[PDB]
Ligand binder design. Structure first.
Ligand code: HEM
Ligand code: HEM
Ligand code: RFQ
Ligand code: RFQ
Ligand code: CL
Ligand code: CL
Lengths: 362, 362
């Protein structure tokens, strides 16, 4: 029935994978084992090599990702053995610790057991493992609006935030068979944060801005050879503009441009003054300066685009078709100063890859 | 034969056009006249109203244009009567004069006779009526590289540029039946230019930058109800970023960022300093400041995006589907500070509209 779809993706993956691993001879027999394993059990289990390489391929095929040059150095933690919520929690804690690596961030993914019957084994509620809570009631707007609904979900379960602008959300997830998720407060020793200061403008610290060191996306599905790993959090390091041009800048996020304009001492009254643009540049300089000063890995959008240019060259000379989403590849500031802006990209979806899936809350 | 295609577009245009003009009753009879006129002559001639409204509709349907709020105030000059190159020249001169309007730019289009048998009556060689020449030989790079090939074509015909960085290209066009185009030097009294100065940084004038006041696109085809007006130059006013973030900024255009960085007194050594971004903002502030100070119409990208938001609202409440090209609608600086970035657009092509056509040179 539906089993047919699994087998097809399995054939396509193993061939491409073993070909890249120089194990092309091993394919016929590996596929055979898979064929009967699917027949008898409905599914099939990846080898360490298949899983590691598949997660790497998936990153390589992520059209919206400018950081793909480094796809082959992805650190893959295999946690398909977890059976308990204490094990899941500790796996998540460990991922944070090893990925952070005292500021010298290692791109890492932790892979939990895949969906069985489409039925999840572990269901992560966090959008990122480290994220700030958001509150909204009676005109009062506190923290990160992006987190408003998860925050309300957490507070249903007996969590309570301090209602600071930077409350760390607890880890929150649900195990198969449990009707309700559990939540665990993040140990503050695990979480690096960076205060935002400006290299030249000493008053920038009056804004009392900060951001977390490591963005760990925990709400996407890794799909590898027909196998659906809904729980598979991954991280890289930030590109500065993600923090300075979006998280802290967007009107629906922290909305700090008017405040930035004030501390940098420019008026925020006239569009033709380009005060938003000027505020953006200083905020973004501030962010890069602050991460580098603390010794936390970060990349600027120009360096990132140069790296991506190498990914493009690398893919061509390896005989691989390149795929990309121009609308996400261009940085939100000075995009025409990067080569990305001035070319176009095939937005075709190639598997393995990371996909969106529906939130369990709201 | 091919006549069928004309008739279809004709039916579609007249219906939509007269409907918008509140002349829906007049359609059946207008179409009838057209039907027999096509039968007897192979083509059909637009009324003043049809032509004017069609050029307006075409602008309204230009997916890449952020300035569309003002589509209905387009000033349409009907020059389908030209038969001579002195008439074409004078029509082009007049367009420049009336559109410039002493700096208070009127959006204007001059419409020349359409293609007959696919055969052009007037063939304009300029990409814009006012543009700077570009030269390239023996490492030496002078003027605007975008104009390198047209410039070489002009110099074939006995034109010679001064080889300044801002030589005005002559008007150059070809009449049906002539094997060769003619060129006419632009009278300098017709052409407003703006020296680029900075409001705060007095040394900015050392760059000796300038740009022309009015961008007059003269190489696109206006298509209205099956009729192909290949020669139909049009203008608006600039959005500042077109000059400051592209014409003067691009490495393949004037490439001035390093020089800007120098006069504004910041180092241009480290990506993480965001010196390109900072140079961009100051150059773009300089451009808006300079146009406004001279009294030449210009719009900043924030004001432009606000206007386009009104176009969006206006289209919806008029019951018209909106179409757009997100990749051209976002400004090349601070695009995430505009609403455009945060929504998406249907890039469908609706006629009437402006289309690319092949250059006659190179
Ligand atoms: C090593 C440093 C990395 C950098 C600097 C980087 C940079 C980025 C940036 C800027 C985005 C766009 C996000 C946005 O603008 O909203 C992005 C998207 C993405 N990146 Fe990366 N990335 C890195 C590593 C990774 C890793 C390790 C993975 C997974 C293994 C990954 C997978 C993705 C995916 C799936 C998206 C798209 C998410 C979506 O569609 O919403 N990246 N990356
Ligand atoms: C009134 C002031 C106007 C402003 C500020 C404006 C602004 C712009 C801008 C910024 C672009 C993109 C060009 C680029 O980034 O390379 C554009 C494209 C365009 N505009 Fe407008 N525009 C205006 C008036 C007009 C008029 C009067 C017409 C024709 C009647 C027009 C038709 C177009 C077309 C056809 C394009 C796309 C050209 C292409 O595909 O290469 N616009 N406009
Ligand atoms: N950036 C856009 N969308 C958007 C809007 C709001 C939030 C958002 O978060 C991405 C966030 O979830 C995310 C996803 C994937 C990677 C990152 N950033 C990172 N450095 C990494 C996290 C984990 C590995 S790399 C961040 C993306 C648009 C571009 C064009 C039109 S809209
Ligand atoms: N801007 C882009 N392409 C591009 C690259 C080089 C030159 C160029 O010139 C447009 C130039 O011919 C042009 C065309 C139409 C309008 C304008 N600008 C104006 N204000 C007007 C001229 C006439 C009426 S409005 C200018 C456009 C891209 C966006 C995203 C990916 S590439
Ligand atoms: Cl983020
Ligand atoms: Cl231009």
């Amino acid at each position: 029935e539906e089993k047919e779809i699994l087998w097809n993706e399995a054939k396509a993956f193993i061939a491409a994978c073993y070909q890249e691993l120089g194990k092309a001879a091993e394919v016929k027999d590996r596929l055979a084992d898979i064929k009967s394993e699917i027949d008898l059990t409905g599914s099939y289990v990846h080898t360490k090599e298949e899983l590691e390489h598949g997660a790497k391929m998936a990153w390589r095929n992520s059209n919206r990702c400018i950081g793909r040059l480094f796809w082959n150095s992805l650190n893959v933690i295999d946690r398909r053995d977890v059976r308990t919520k204490e094990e899941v929690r500790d796996a998540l804690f460990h991922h944070i610790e090893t990925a952070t690596n005292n500021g010298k961030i290692r791109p890492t993914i932790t892979i939990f057991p895949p969906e069985e019957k489409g039925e999840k084994q572990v269901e992560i509620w966090n959008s990122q493992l480290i994220r700030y809570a958001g509150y909204e009631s009676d005109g009062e707007r506190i923290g990160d609006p992006a987190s408003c609904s998860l925050t309300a979900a957490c507070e249903e379960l007996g969590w309570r935030g301090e209602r600071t602008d930077f409350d760390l959300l607890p880890l929150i997830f649900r195990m198969k068979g449990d009707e309700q998720p559990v939540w665990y407060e993040l140990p503050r020793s695990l979480v690096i944060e960076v205060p935002i200061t400006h290299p030249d403008i000493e008053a920038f610290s009056d804004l009392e801005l900060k951001w977390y060191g490591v963005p760990i996306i925990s709400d996407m599905k890794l799909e590898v050879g027909g196998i659906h790993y809904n729980a598979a959090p991954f991280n890289g390091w930030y590109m500065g503009t993600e923090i300075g041009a979006r998280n802290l800048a967007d009107e629906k996020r922290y909305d700090k441009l008017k405040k930035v304009a004030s501390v940098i001492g420019i008026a925020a009254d006239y569009n033709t003054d380009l005060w938003k643009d000027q505020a953006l540049v200083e905020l973004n300089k501030a962010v890069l300066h602050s991460y580098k000063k603390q010794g936390v890995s970060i990349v600027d959008h120009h360096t990132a685009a140069s790296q991506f240019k190498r990914f493009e060259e690398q893919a061509e000379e390896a005989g691989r078709k390149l795929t990309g989403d121009w609308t996400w590849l261009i940085p939100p500031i000075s995009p025409a100063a990067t080569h990305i802006f001035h070319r176009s990209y095939d937005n075709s979806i190639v598997k393995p890859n990371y996909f969106y899936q529906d939130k369990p809350y709201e």
